[PDB]
Amino acid sequence: CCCGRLIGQHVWSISKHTQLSPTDAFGTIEFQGGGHSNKAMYVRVSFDTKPDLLLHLMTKEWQLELPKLLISVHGGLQNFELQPKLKQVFGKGLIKAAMTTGAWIFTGGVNTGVIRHVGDALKDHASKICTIGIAPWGIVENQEDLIGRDVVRPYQTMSNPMSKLTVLNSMHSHFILADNGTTGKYGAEVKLRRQLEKHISLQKINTRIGQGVPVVALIVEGGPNVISIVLEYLRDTPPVPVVVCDGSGRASDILAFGHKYSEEGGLINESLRDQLLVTIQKTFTYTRTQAQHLFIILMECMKKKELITVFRMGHQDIDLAILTALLKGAN
Amino acid sequence: ASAPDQLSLALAWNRVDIARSQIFIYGQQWPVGSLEQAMLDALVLDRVDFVKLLIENGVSMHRFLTISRLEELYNTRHGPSNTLYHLVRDVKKREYLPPDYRISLIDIGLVIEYLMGGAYRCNYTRKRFRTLYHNLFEINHFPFPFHELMVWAVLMKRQKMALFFWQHGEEAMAKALVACKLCKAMAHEASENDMVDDISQELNHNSRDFGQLAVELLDQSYKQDEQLAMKLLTYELKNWSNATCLQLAVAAKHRDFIAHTCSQMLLTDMWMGRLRMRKNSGLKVILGILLPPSILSLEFKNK
Amino acid sequence: QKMALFFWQHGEEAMAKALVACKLCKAMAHEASENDMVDDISQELNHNSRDFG
Amino acid sequence: KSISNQVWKFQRYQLIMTFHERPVLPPPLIIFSHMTMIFQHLCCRWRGLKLFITDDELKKVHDFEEQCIEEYFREKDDRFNSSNDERIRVTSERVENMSMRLEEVNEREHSMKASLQTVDIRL
Amino acid sequence: GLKLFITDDELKKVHDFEEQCIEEYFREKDDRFNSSNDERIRVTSERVENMSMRLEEVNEREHSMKASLQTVDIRL
Numbered sequence: 001c002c003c004g005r006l007i008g009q010h011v012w013s014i015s016k017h018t019q020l021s022p023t024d025a026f027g028t029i030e031f032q033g034g035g036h037s038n039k040a041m042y043v044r045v046s047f048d049t050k051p052d053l054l055l056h057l058m059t060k061e062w063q064l065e066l067p068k069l070l071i072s073v074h075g076g077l078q079n080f081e082l083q084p085k086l087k088q089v090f091g092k093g094l095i096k097a098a099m100t101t102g103a104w105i106f107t108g109g110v111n112t113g114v115i116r117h118v119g120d121a122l123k124d125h126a127s128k129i130c131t132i133g134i135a136p137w138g139i140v141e142n143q144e145d146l147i148g149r150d151v152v153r154p155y156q157t158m159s160n161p162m163s164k165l166t167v168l169n170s171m172h173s174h175f176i177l178a179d180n181g182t183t184g185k186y187g188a189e190v191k192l193r194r195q196l197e198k199h200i201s202l203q204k205i206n207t208r209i210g211q212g213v214p215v216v217a218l219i220v221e222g223g224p225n226v227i228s229i230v231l232e233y234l235r236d237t238p239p240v241p242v243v244v245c246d247g248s249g250r251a252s253d254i255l256a257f258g259h260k261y262s263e264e265g266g267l268i269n270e271s272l273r274d275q276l277l278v279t280i281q282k283t284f285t286y287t288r289t290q291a292q293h294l295f296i297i298l299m300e301c302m303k304k305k306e307l308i309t310v311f312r313m314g315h316q317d318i319d320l321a322i323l324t325a326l327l328k329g330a331n
Numbered sequence: 332a333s334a335p336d337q338l339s340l341a342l343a344w345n346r347v348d349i350a351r352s353q354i355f356i357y358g359q360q361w362p363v364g365s366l367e368q369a370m371l372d373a374l375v376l377d378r379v380d381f382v383k384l385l386i387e388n389g390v391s392m393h394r395f396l397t398i399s400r401l402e403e404l405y406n407t408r409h410g411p412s413n414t415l416y417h418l419v420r421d422v423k424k425r426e427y428l429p430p431d432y433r434i435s436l437i438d439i440g441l442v443i444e445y446l447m448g449g450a451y452r453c454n455y456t457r458k459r460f461r462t463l464y465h466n467l468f469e470i471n472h473f474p475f476p477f478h479e480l481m482v483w484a485v486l487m488k489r490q491k492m493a494l495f496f497w498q499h500g501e502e503a504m505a506k507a508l509v510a511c512k513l514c515k516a517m518a519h520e521a522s523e524n525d526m527v528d529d530i531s532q533e534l535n536h537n538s539r540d541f542g543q544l545a546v547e548l549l550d551q552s553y554k555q556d557e558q559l560a561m562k563l564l565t566y567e568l569k570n571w572s573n574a575t576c577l578q579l580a581v582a583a584k585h586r587d588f589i590a591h592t593c594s595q596m597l598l599t600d601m602w603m604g605r606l607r608m609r610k611n612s613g614l615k616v617i618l619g620i621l622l623p624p625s626i627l628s629l630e631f632k633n634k
Numbered sequence: 635q636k637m638a639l640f641f642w643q644h645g646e647e648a649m650a651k652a653l654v655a656c657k658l659c660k661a662m663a664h665e666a667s668e669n670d671m672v673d674d675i676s677q678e679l680n681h682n683s684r685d686f687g
Numbered sequence: 688k689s690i691s692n693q694v695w696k697f698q699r700y701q702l703i704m705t706f707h708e709r710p711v712l713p714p715p716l717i718i719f720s721h722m723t724m725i726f727q728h729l730c731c732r733w734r735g736l737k738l739f740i741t742d743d744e745l746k747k748v749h750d751f752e753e754q755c756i757e758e759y760f761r762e763k764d765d766r767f768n769s770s771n772d773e774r775i776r777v778t779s780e781r782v783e784n785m786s787m788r789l790e791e792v793n794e795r796e797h798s799m800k801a802s803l804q805t806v807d808i809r810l
Numbered sequence: 811g812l813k814l815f816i817t818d819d820e821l822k823k824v825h826d827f828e829e830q831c832i833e834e835y836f837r838e839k840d841d842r843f844n845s846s847n848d849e850r851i852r853v854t855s856e857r858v859e860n861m862s863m864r865l866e867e868v869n870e871r872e873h874s875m876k877a878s879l880q881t882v883d884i885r886l
Contacts, residue, residue, distance in 0.1 A: 498756065498760070501749040501752065501753065502749070502752075503752060503756060504752065547759060548752075548755055548756065548759055551755045551758055551759045551762070552751070552752070552755045555751070555754075555755060555758070556751065559747070559748060559751045562738060562740065562744075562748055563748055563751070563752060565736050565737060565738040566737075566738050566739075566740045566745065566748065567737055567738075567739055567740070575736060575737055577700065577736060581697070581700050581701070584697075586690070586693040586694070586696075586697055587693060589696060589697055589699075589700050590692070590693050590696045590697070594700075595696060595699070597736070598699055598700060598703050601703055601707065601735060601736055602699075602703050
């Protein structure tokens with residue numbers, strides 16, 4: 001159907017005609033398989049809810065203290081590959097920053113792409129820190145396994161290679177499942193995650209050194225949605241800084257190659273601009289008609305280079321860039 | 332073929348990587364009781380990396396280890412040789428043997444009483460477990476399975492399995508001191524029967540390694556938090572015949588456990604009671620003994 | 635201790651500073667062993683006195 | 688002489704536990720303390736290094752002990768991977784892999800140089 | 811006795827002398843630490859790390875450049 005489910009498996013209002021029901025599946029996941037057993041609580045939350053009530057959940061009903069950092073793990077949705085040493089230094093710097101600041105890590109949650117590299121980081125850690133995931137309910141594999149009120153449900157690492165559904169990573173410490181009513185479609189978690197990050201960043205911290213509880217959002221590769229969310233990050237009030245990691249490709253390498261040769265934002269020479277446009281059109285296989293639109297969106301991003309922080313490997317972990325952008329985006 | 336037979340061939344080849352890559356994959360329809368029987372075969376054959384694979388993929392060791400399963404682990408011969416037969420024969424001779432003797436959990440309990448010595452009275456020999464044995468040969472399961480499995484691995488010479496079973500679980504330092512005492516006592520029983528140097532030297536080496544694990548765990552616990560280290564060395568081990576780790580180590584004659592700053596500080600704190608007038612003592616103690624007014628000029632620790 | 639070593643490098647009359655530090659650490663070791671503090675404290679102070687010496 | 692200190696610190700436990708077990712009064716006067724123990728026991732029945740812990744505090748001891756095992760094994764792994772023997776081993780393995788890889792790059796450079804010469808001939 | 815009462819002008823030269831011998835002693839232990847076999851094994855290991863990742867990269871780049879040269883020769 002339009003919701004993507006089976007025609008006989010049933011039982012936004014535009015074309016899906018949803019009815020607003022109370023929540024029914026929430027509790028604790030026992031992760032059997034995949035090495036060590038890890039307990040991770042989960043709550044199904046509708047995508048159009050108020051963020052203060054999720055804040056009250058995470059403070060009172062979850063016994064999680066208010067952190068000093070929010071290391072977002074936004075990246076490419078599809079599964080990719082990286083250098084082994086680059087992934088190792090990425091994971092070491094990520095867990096080092098997570099233990100030094102006591103951060104909450106907003107990893108995507110489904111085990112495809114940069115989320116699997118976050119799971120590789122937590123395998124290096126292997127011993128607090130929160131790893132709250134924001135993944136859609138419609139895309140998680142074995143949806144019937146996670147049905148139950150306050151029940152410790154078994155969740156295996158069963159991942160069919162031909163199934164469209166993706167199993168969650170087994171070593172997140174917590175989970176939020178954004179339910180818009182549909183199955184197998186993305187976009188159900190983005191707006192809820194943005195309003196959650198905004199409502200957390202409006203909270204005044206106990207130390208109050210900067211401006212409330214600070215957020216540092218990290219990008220590895222990504223599509224045009226990565227460029228759009230960096231544009232949303234920089235134009236945000238307050239202006240949350242962005243750490244990008246090159247040596248990987250896609251939008252992050254284009255952002256770093258621009259940032260090395262941009263000077264005062266729009267001060268880019270003609271040959272470098274044409275090279276960036278042709279690598280957008282051919283290396284990332286984007287459309288040439290929207291290449292100029294992505295270039296001017298990149299220029300709107302590029303007007304605020306004082307918060308974009310890059311990391312070039314070549315010891316020298318990513319936590320240097322994380323703490324440097326933390327001190328930049330604090331006022 | 333079926334995945335139990337594939338995993339059986341993997342156990343035969345001693346190649347954990349092959350099973351890791353192919354046998355334990357997504358979609359593999361494991362039948363009822365396949366992993367429990369495979370775990371039994373992996374334990375009796377001493378294939379510790381396959382036990383690691385089967386506990387990583389999910390076998391629920393608490394549900395696996397029962398009365399009959401641990402008994403079958405004690406009567407197996409499909410592995411390394413042990414000195415268990417001589418020990419069971421000696422304790423059944425002293426307490427009062429056919430070659431087809433199905434050695435019971437009660438008899439192994441008597442073996443732990445004989446080797447541990449002193450006043451160690453094992454949970455196997457206790458009356459409640461005796462009525463459980465007399466009425467059955469989660470009630471038949473074991474609340475602390477890694478304890479019984481480490482006693483299994485220590486008692487039957489399986490050392491790498493004993494290290495692995497030491498790692499997983501709790502009350503591990505008490506487990507290490509009990510393992511040290513059992514390995515030393517089996518070494519002493521083998522050398523009193525003056526057999527080959529290999530068995531006595533190897534069991535002595537086993538006791539030295541396990542005691543060294545106990546010492547290095549003591550050092551780490553002392554580096555992290557001193558007060559919880561004192562709590563670790565003094566609490567009542569309900570599973571280890573109601574003693575403390577100090578009593579088990581002094582039973583084990585284990586010199587560099589009670590040589591360390593934690594144990595000596597605890598003994599010094601016990602030595603002088605609630606008295607804080609404890610600098611250049613001895614002479615002050617004698618002066619307080621001879622003079623009853625001399626106590627009132629001494630510092631005392633508060634409650 | 636590392637603060638003392640940094641303060642040793644930065645400054646003058648450093649040989650006298652090192653010898654006084656040696657005597658002070660040995661005397662603190664003997665004074666702490668007189669009150670029967672933990673042997674790590676006393677052995678650390680003797681190690682420090684041997685270091686400055 | 689090599690074991691002296693360890694023997695002393697072992698026998699300390701024995702004599703501290705023994706003299707904790709003994710009564711308050713000396714052996715010539717111990718009949719008085721004996722009668723006070725009999726009086727206490729026969730009014731409480733006929734009418735020191737064992738800290739008895741509650742379950743929750745015991746659970747904190749278990750969690751503390753588990754993180755001590757984790758720190759022990761990671762410290763042993765770091766010490767094994769930072770010893771000279773393992774470093775020389777792994778360095779030898781990568782240098783052999785490098786020498787094969789550099790030979791492969793060298794042959795491919797021969798192919799690329801021949802192709803470049805042919806392209807310059809064709810242009 | 812041995813106590814030589816020193817004027818301030820001589821004391822300045824003794825102080826500066828002591829400064830030089832402290833600086834030589836610190837640079838001398840730095841040279842000993844950077845010539846001991848242990849640190850040499852460590853730096854050799856790390857340099858082989860970085861260069862092995864570099865050489866694997868060079869192999870991938872080589873294959874790409876060889877393919878590009880072959881395609882350019884084909885389209886000529």
